Structures are given as C-alpha cells and as structure tokens.
C-alpha cells in the first residue's frame, strides 16, 4: 500500500531499464539489505503488466541459494516494488569476458551451481527458456560467490508432458527442438547449459554465424567441434559432459539431476578444500 | 495452374536470360519474399525443357542454407514459375573482382561455406559439375552473408561408382579426369573448389592460358605454382589444403567432408567472435 517507503530506506541506484530502476535498499527494522526494482506501473502496457505478474508469481515460489530470490512484491500508488536479493558481483557474462575463460576446476564449480539452480526450477515445474551468461549474476565479487539465476520473464510452468510453448529464447542458446518448432519442455534449459559450459572453458560459443539461417542449421544439426589448440588440453570428461547436454534429440539429452552426478562435476579435487580450522559462531 | 498470380505479388526485375526473366515477388498471405524465375515455355526447345525439368527436380530435393533453394515450381498457360530464395548480394565472382582478393580468414570462411554446400550435395548423390564464382551467390550485401550454390543445369545424380557422364563444365575449372575422358564422380567438384580457393587468396586462377591445348595440358598435369610476392605471406596450411584439392588422381583427392575437418578451416580464431550479448527473441 505504502508498505515500501514506510519499511525500507532507499539507497543508491544499481541499474535502470525501460519503465524501471533498481536501487539498493535497507529494511528499517531489521537492517537487511536488498535490491528494489521500482516499476512505473501507470506507464506499463497491458502485455508488460502481464509479464510482470507472471514473473513475480513464478519468482516468489522459487527459494534456492542460486536463484536471485524475490522477498516482497508491493504495489504503491504509481510504482510497484519488487524486493529481491542484492547481488553485487555483476553478470557472469562480464566475468567470463574479464577472465577470458575458466579453468576446468572453476568451470566445473560454476556449471555445478547453474545446474543446481536449473534442477531446482525443473523439480518445481518451471522452465526458464532463456538461460545465458547475462542472466546469471554473481552474488558478490568474492571468489566462490553463489552464481544466481535471474530474469524469469520468459519462464513457463510445465507438467510432465511436452507442449508447444512458442518460439522464444536467445538465438545462440536456442535448442534444436525450439528451432524445429517441436513440442518441448525442461530439456531446452539443459541445451543452454551446454552452450554456457562450452563458453566457460574456452571463452567463445559452440554455435556462431553472422548468417542466422546458417546458425540455426548448425544448432539443429548439433554441428560444433573442439578446435585446437585451446581444446587440446581440456579433458575428455569435460567434452563428454558438453556432448551429453548438446544432444540434439531432447529425449536422449542429459537432465540437470543426471549431470550433477557426473564425475567431472562431483569428483572432488580437495587439496585446497581439505579440513581447515573454522571459527565458532555464537549468536546467544 | 494459375497458382502464381493468385498467390504472389510481382515486384521489380532482378535479371534476364534467354527465354526467362527473374523478378522479386512477395507471397501475398505470408509476406515472404522470393525471386521468381519466369520462363516462356512455349518458346523452349525440347532439350531446353529437358534441362528445366532436370534442374527443378534436382533443386527441389536440396535444402541447405548454402544452396539457393527452390520452394515452388508452377506451370501457368505459357509461363513456368520457379520460386527460389531471394539473394541480393550478387555473384561471388563480382565480390572477388571488387575486393581483388580475400584475407586468409575470409577465404577460409568463404570456402568453408562452399564446401559445406558441396558436401551436402554429394551426400545426396548430386554432383554439380560446374562450380565457379559466377555460380555462387551472396545472400545479401551484409558481410558474413551465406554464400549460396546456384545453377544446377549441369548437375548429375550419381551412385557409389564412377561413370563417364560426358564432357561438360567450364574450362578453367575442369578436372583432369574429365579432360582425360576418364569415368568420374564427386571429386570433380572438389577440384573446382581448389581452383576457387586459389582464386580467393590471390585474385587470379591457378590455370590460365589463351591457348586451350596448353591450358588443358597444364590442368591434366596439375601444373600450377605459388608465385611471389603475393603467395609469400600466405600460410603453408592454406597451400597444403589447395594441394589436397588440386590432386590429379581423383582417388587420392580430398573429399568435401575431409576438407571441412582441416585445421585451416576449423581452427577458430575467435577474438572477434568471443562471447557477445545477444537480444532475446520473443514471438509469443
Ligand atoms: Mg538479461
Ligand atoms: Mg552461371
């Protein structure tokens, strides 16, 4: 109602879009920090509003450390306030660009988190449909910070069967079944995970062509390779996992639950994560 | 029947030949654009008609982004209408002339597409027999536009063996086996690909003589070289690939499938094709 200005202190602007700005805020009585997406609702089109309602509704259900969580959704006179987790680490996209590419150890940890977020969504009947590095946010700048899934604006709710949910997504990450206009479901997100994993390891995507007819033909055929020298020193296990995700027939494609059990993901190299002294916590 | 004028709006003339004109057209109910080759069929000779039937039949089977595709073939009273992909980028011939020659990076991308079109034809039992820059069309003027194979007027359907299919093709691109009048097959097109690749890199052909007896002797012997200074700075990999294609014995000549796996073709220099932000598509 006026439940936002009464309850939160607004701080500095974090970002802006069409019809909205995101500002950091602090809840007054508890001191917890959040990011408030502040939307001018009198200037939203009927479709824009439909998309906001769907995204808030889907987002409110999803509570996992690797999802940017929605904590409150508040309608004031002319503005709507969506109070999300605060993330300060920037997009995974920007981090890949800055680092050029990830070691196998880092890529494995990164895609593990991405797959855990996707497994959690799928177990709750949500298919994201637009997974890409721009939609994955690092919780903070500290190494090991959670990678968190964002932007559920294209997400759909699914049951246990495939359906034609429409042509939507981002071209370099689109799955063959969406490009063929076949009914589809959860596996579309695993194909995008495969694209991301390939990008993590070498810093460029498996499917790239300035002619979109060629690009979509290549995706539909599952036509990609592992060029020298950059792939030369990458393990067969990493490539095999990518192949399992970039499997053209979605019925034969690995699921997120299955991928999380693959040795390359869960065979723990633990010299730098052996036992360590830990401080006591005492909140009594 | 009258299925063309009822279904398409004809626009401006794109080109003309003997017995035909090509005009851009727009399909009325979908709005898609095409190039219609409009042929006066009452003025075609029996052989001309045989060639039209063969070319339409072969062309209708071939669906690949790097082939100028035939979408419909419609007989009206006195005119036949072949509704093809619209290409606005002109012949590869004209683009080579305008640019003089291609960088190794550009030549590699260009011949990759040409080889992909040829590999697709060969896998479908079609040998083009007349591959040359005049028969390769750029889909549009934008850089990276698909290079598309055209003019299947001399194409043949082959099984897994060699046969004598006759003496036909274009002199500077003819293979040694056709000039020797040996049985031949798919490899003839790879020899022409080699001629084209040499032309792409330096802007002139490997075999040129105003005396045709000399020209054909030189081709049959595989007699060409890499003159200074223009070849001086071209990599050994580019030359080795050309040598593999310009291999006189067709049984030892590289195939299109094999050439597409050569590092010079698929070792991706990807600084300018690393990850990039991509827009969402939403057609819902
Ligand atoms: Mg985004
Ligand atoms: Mg021609």
Cα gap B69→B213, rounded to integer Å:
37
Containing H/E element for B108? helix B104-123
3-class secondary structure for B122-148?
Answer: HHCCEECCCCCHHHEEECCCCCCCCEE
**Which residues from A are below 8 Å from B284, CB to CB?**
165-168
Q: Where are the domains of chain B?
A: 1-86, 87-284
Nearest CA distance, B197 vs chain A (angstrom): 21
Q: Is A268 exposed, middle or buried (0-12, 13-18, 19+ CB in 10 A)?
A: exposed
Cα gap B150→B148, rounded to integer Å:
6
Cα gap A79→A81, rounded to integer Å:
7
Contact B40, B20 (CB under 8 A): yes
Distances (CA, A) of A58 to A19, A72, A158: 20, 13, 12
Peptide bond into B229 cis (omega under 30): yes
What are phi and psi for residue B27, nearest 5 degrees? -70, 135
Question: Which residues, listed in sequence order, are joined to residue B34 by a DSSP beta bridge?
Answer: B25
Cα gap B74→B221, rounded to integer Å:
46
Q: How many CB atoms lie within 10 A of CB B58?
A: 20
Helices (H), A187-248: 187-202, 212-221, 236-245
CA B133 / ligand 2 centre spacing (Å): 8
Ligand index nearest the alpha carbon of residue B277: 1
Q: How many CB atoms lie within 10 A of CB A272?
A: 7
Contact B68, B87 (CB under 8 A): yes
DSSP 8-class letter at A266: H
CATH number (3.40.50.460, 3.30.200.20, 3.10.50.40, 3.40.640.10) of A1-86 reads 3.30.200.20
Q: In this complex, which of A169, A203, A211 lies closest to B275 when CB atoms are compared?
A: A203
What does DSSP say about strands B20-27 and A147-149: parallel, antiparallel, or unpaired?
Answer: unpaired
Cα gap B91→B15, rounded to integer Å:
12
User: CB neighbours of A274 closer than 8 A, spacing ≥ 6?
Assistant: none
Q: Does the distance separating the beta carbons of B267 and A227 come in below 8 Å?
A: yes
Cα gap B10→B4, rounded to integer Å:
9
Question: Which residues, listed in sequence order, are joined to residue B17 by a DSSP beta bridge?
Answer: B20
Contact B266, A227 (CB under 8 A): yes
The candidate with the shortest Cα–Cα distance to A184, out of A192, A175, A193, is A175
Question: Which residues, listed in sequence order, are joined to residue A27 by a DSSP beta bridge?
Answer: A8
User: CB neighbours of A257 closer than 8 A, spacing ≥ 6?
Assistant: A119, A122, A123
Distances (CA, A) of A162 to A159, A250, B120: 8, 10, 32
**Which residues from A are below 8 Å from B139, CB to CB?**
211, 213
DSSP 8-class letter at B30: T
Nearest CA distance, A196 vs chain B (angstrom): 10
Contact A92, A172 (CB under 8 A): no
**With the C-alpha atoms ordered B67, B71, B73, B74, is the resulting torsion angle positive or negative?**
negative
Ligand index nearest the alpha carbon of residue B68: 2
Q: Where are the beta strands (DSSP E) in chain A?
A: 8-17, 20-27, 33-40, 70-75, 79-84, 126-127, 136-138, 147-149, 156-157, 168-169
Q: Does the distance separating the beta carbons of B268 and A167 come in below 8 Å?
A: no
SS3 label, residue A14: strand
CA B54 / ligand 2 centre spacing (Å): 16
CA B134 / ligand 2 centre spacing (Å): 5
Distances (CA, A) of B259 to A135, B191, B238, B268: 38, 12, 11, 15
Contact B149, B66 (CB under 8 A): yes
DSSP 8-class letter at B37: E
SS3 label, residue A32: coil
Nearest CA distance, A175 vs chain B (angstrom): 13
What are phi and psi for residue A136, nearest 5 degrees? -120, 125
CA dihedral A148, A70, A128, A114 (to 10 degrees): 20
CA angle B190, B194, B210 (to 5 degrees): 115
Contact B133, B199 (CB under 8 A): yes
User: CB neighbours of A199 closer than 8 A, spacing ≥ 6?
Assistant: A96, A133, A205, A206, B275
What does DSSP say about strands B70-75 and B33-40: parallel, antiparallel, or unpaired?
Answer: unpaired
User: CB neighbours of A206 closer than 8 A, spacing ≥ 6?
Assistant: A194, A195, A198, A199, A224, A242, A246
What are A's interface residues with B at a Cβ cutoff of 8 A?
Answer: 93, 96-97, 130, 132-134, 154, 165-173, 199, 202-205, 208-211, 213-214, 217, 225, 227-228
**Which residues from B are below 8 Å from A202, CB to CB?**
270
The candidate with the shortest Cα–Cα distance to B259, out of B206, B204, B196, B199, is B196
The candidate with the shortest Cα–Cα distance to A156, out of B284, B112, B2, is B284
CA A129 / ligand 1 centre spacing (Å): 12
Q: Does the distance separating the beta carbons of A167 and B281 come in below 8 Å?
A: yes
Q: Does the distance separating the beta carbons of A169 and B139 come in below 8 Å?
A: no
What are B's interface residues with A at a Cβ cutoff of 8 A?
Answer: 64-66, 113, 139, 142-146, 263, 266-268, 270, 273-275, 277-284
Distances (CA, A) of A213 to A217, A230, B114: 6, 27, 15
Contact B226, A185 (CB under 8 A): no
Q: Does the distance separating the beta carbons of B275 and A96 come in below 8 Å?
A: yes
Contact A26, A8 (CB under 8 A): yes
Listed residues: CB within 5 A of ion ligand 2: B 134-135, 151
Question: Which residues, listed in sequence order, are joined to residue B10 by a DSSP beta bridge?
Answer: B25
Q: Is B279 exposed, middle or buried (0-12, 13-18, 19+ CB in 10 A)?
A: exposed
Note every long-range contact of A261-267, with CB atoms under 8 Å and residues 24 or more positions apart, other chains counting.
A262/A237, A263/A237, A264/A104, A264/A108, A264/A235, A264/A237, A264/A238, A264/A240, A265/A108, A265/A111, A265/A112, A265/A115, A265/A241, A266/A112
- Residues A87-284, CATH architecture: Orthogonal Bundle (1.10)
Peptide bond into A229 cis (omega under 30): yes
Listed residues: CB within 5 A of ion ligand 1: A 134-135, 151
The candidate with the shortest Cα–Cα distance to B136, out of B195, B217, B50, is B195
Cα gap B9→B24, rounded to integer Å:
9
DSSP 8-class letter at A62: -
Q: In this complex, which of B146, B267, B281 lies closest to A171 when CB atoms are compared?
A: B281
Containing H/E element for A51? helix A46-61
CA A135 / ligand 1 centre spacing (Å): 5
Q: Does the distance separating the beta carbons of B273 and A227 come in below 8 Å?
A: no
DSSP 8-class letter at A16: E
Contact B42, B123 (CB under 8 A): no
Q: Does the distance separating the beta carbons of B268 and A168 come in below 8 Å?
A: no
Contact B210, B203 (CB under 8 A): no
What are phi and psi for residue A84, nearest 5 degrees? -110, 165
Contact A258, A190 (CB under 8 A): no
Contact A178, A128 (CB under 8 A): no
User: CB neighbours of B55 closer than 8 A, spacing ≥ 6?
Assistant: B152, B153, B155
Contact B128, B121 (CB under 8 A): yes
User: CB neighbours of B180 closer than 8 A, spacing ≥ 6?
Assistant: B220
The candidate with the shortest Cα–Cα distance to B19, out of B88, B78, B91, is B78
Cα gap B187→B242, rounded to integer Å:
14
DSSP 8-class letter at B100: S
SS3 label, residue B94: helix
Closest A-chain CA to B270 = A204
CA A137 / ligand 1 centre spacing (Å): 10
Closest A-chain CA to B66 = A214
Q: Is A100 exposed, middle or buried (0-12, 13-18, 19+ CB in 10 A)?
A: exposed
Q: Is B231 exposed, middle or buried (0-12, 13-18, 19+ CB in 10 A)?
A: middle
Nearest CA distance, B267 vs chain A (angstrom): 5
**Which residues from A are below 8 Å from B64, CB to CB?**
217
Nearest CA distance, A29 vs chain B (angstrom): 39
Closest A-chain CA to B269 = A227
Distance of alpha carbon A183 from the chain centroid: 23
Please tell me the number of Cα atoms within 13 Å of A10 on its side-chain side.
14
Q: Does the distance separating the beta carbons of B284 and A167 come in below 8 Å?
A: yes
């Amino acid at each position: 109602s006026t439940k936002f200005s009464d309850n939160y202190d607004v701080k500095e602007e974090l970002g802006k879009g069409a019809f909205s700005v995101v500002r950091r805020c602090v809840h007054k009585t508890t001191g917890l920090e959040f990011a408030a997406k502040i939307i001018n609702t009198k200037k939203l089109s009927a479709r824009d509003f439909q998309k906001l309602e769907r995204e808030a509704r889907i987002c409110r259900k999803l509570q996992h450390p690797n999802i940017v969580r929605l904590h409150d959704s508040i309608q004031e006179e002319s503005f709507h306030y969506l109070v999300f987790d605060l993330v300060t680490g920037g997009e995974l996209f920007e981090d890949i660009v800055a680092r050029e590419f990830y070691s196998e150890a880092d890529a494995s940890h990164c895609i593990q988190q991405i797959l855990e977020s996707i497994a959690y969504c799928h177990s709750n009947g949500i298919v994201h449909r637009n997974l890409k590095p721009e939609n994955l946010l690092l919780a903070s700048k500290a190494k090991g910070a959670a990678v968190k899934l964002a932007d559920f604006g294209l997400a759909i709710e699914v049951n246990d069967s495939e359906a034609w949910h429409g042509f939507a997504g981002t071209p370099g990450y689109l799955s063959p079944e969406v490009l063929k206009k076949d009914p589809y479901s959860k596996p579309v997100d695993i194909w995008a995970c495969g694209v991301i994993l390939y990008i993590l390891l070498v810093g460029y995507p498996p499917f790239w062509d300035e002619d979109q007819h060629r690009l979509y033909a290549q995706i539909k055929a599952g036509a990609y390779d592992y060029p020298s020298p950059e792939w030369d020193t990458v393990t067969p296990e990493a490539k095999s996992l990518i192949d399992s995700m970039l499997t053209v027939n979605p019925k034969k494609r690995i699921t997120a639950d299955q991928a999380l059990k693959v040795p390359w993901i869960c065979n723990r190299e633990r010299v730098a994560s052996a036992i360590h002294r830990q401080d006591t916590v005492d909140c009594l």
